[PDB]
Design a protein around this ligand. Structure first.
Ligand SMILES: N[C@@H](CCC(=O)O)C(=O)O
Ligand SMILES: [Cl-]
Lengths: 260, 258
């Protein structure tokens, strides 16, 4: 049987090829998660079809209806066999689906326009001349909203009350705001995306300081799925063989536009 | 029934307190994994006893007898219920015990005596005047044994054929060998331990180069153990609450003695 893989279009994980109209099936797509899916399938011995999650979401449980959306929902309700995507291992997701050990690490990080005089979260928190914010929804805003840590609590109070709004609707809007604000806006986002954008023309942004937290992306399967064991062993093997490091270097740096 | 926790004396994870003979039970010990054990037990609602691994090893399988030693062995053969320790999640271990998602990241790294003219693994691999090795019965030695990455493969061939032996039985032995060999021994050990030691007296060692790999430590249980689910959920909760980061900052805090 062909294994149904649910994933999401986000660069550089999964992208439609420029010439996709001339291609078929899995060959329409490229990226880190496309390469990872092929390696997993080869090690586990299965054929697969890449499908893009209908609602474009990662996975959260609606407060009112209690229905899981996104890739997580596709697994929970039995519509897909596996999710191969930048999907973070979190407590509430682990309660409803199985996860491999993580294939990539990340944490919340600061993006500045080059030249901005900020080196750390502590620096941002202690000032207001350089405004700073997050996506208007999702996991990074939630991190600050929920934090009991003093520095991050202070940052949340500032962001929630800052005018005009320091929040943005999309990643692209956050990046454009950093680039157009003459050093007066810093954007808080996942370190993996920050690193990727640091390698996009016009090469005017950079990641600064240590990460604010630590977490990992994992491959997800329905709870109790037999496929989960083999997939987890494959991730651990690909890590030890150095293949995951090779794939991150390929998509972030070999294909990067801003030099070393 | 009281849960039997196996762990290992390795700074700053588990250390015997200076006045331990005046203390009783779990209070004899301090460190990151001692604090983590307390937190896991509280979230999971069990009572527990910290016990130090009988043979002083992390855990590997004998290639001839196929018997596991160290903390891994204590779980496999039923001598302990759980390991709370800097125990690295690896493929060969995952096949025989259960692991939580990782509670801490690390990578293999190089420790030298100050002044040693080595800056990278590639530098080590290209010479023999400065000997280099690692710990027996752990994940670092297994990593070199199995690696086909050119530089690491060459390092393993060197280590296997070096005379006298470049391997050590405990982390403490490896560190003492660096300190006493006048620049002629380098030690391959995890970045977490390397960085803790660099910040403390006698201030005569240092970490050089980037890490060779990236991996994590996990809480381990016998395969199929019912305690596994709850412990894994507690690790994720403690991560999300910021508690793991709090413990890391506490135990790796730089007092500035170096
Ligand atoms: N943490 C390692 C021990 C140290 C090492 O081998 O470098 C293990 O679980 O075996
Ligand atoms: Cl750059």
């Amino acid at each position: 049987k062909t294994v149904v893989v649910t994933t999401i279009l986000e660069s550089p994980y999964v992208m439609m090829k420029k010439n996709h109209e001339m291609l078929e099936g899995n060959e329409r797509y490229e990226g880190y998660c496309v390469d990872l899916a092929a390696e997993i399938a080869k090690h586990c011995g299965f054929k697969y079809k890449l499908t893009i999650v209908g609602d474009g979401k990662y996975g959260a449980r609606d407060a009112d209806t209690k229905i899981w959306n996104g890739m997580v929902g596709e697994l929970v309700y039995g519509k897909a066999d596996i999710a191969i995507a930048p999907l973070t291992i979190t407590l509430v997701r682990e309660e409803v689906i199985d996860f491999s050990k993580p294939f990539m690490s990340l944490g919340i990080s600061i993006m500045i326009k080059k030249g901005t005089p900020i080196e750390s979260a502590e620096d941002l928190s202690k000032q207001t001349e350089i405004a700073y914010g997050t996506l208007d929804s999702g996991s990074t805003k939630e991190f600050f909203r929920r934090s009991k840590i003093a520095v991050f609590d202070k940052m949340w109070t500032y962001m929630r009350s800052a005018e005009p709004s320091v929040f943005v609707r999309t990643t692209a809007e956050g990046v454009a705001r950093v680039r157009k604000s003459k050093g007066k806006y810093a954007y808080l986002l996942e370190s993996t995306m920050n690193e990727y954008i640091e390698q996009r023309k016009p090469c005017d942004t950079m990641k600064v300081g240590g990460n604010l937290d630590s977490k990992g992306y994992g491959i997800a399967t329905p709870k109790g799925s037999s496929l989960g064991n083999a997939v987890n062993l494959a991730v651990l093997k690909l890590n030890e063989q150095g293949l995951l490091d090779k794939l991150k270097n390929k998509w972030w740096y070999d294909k990067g536009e801003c030099g070393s």
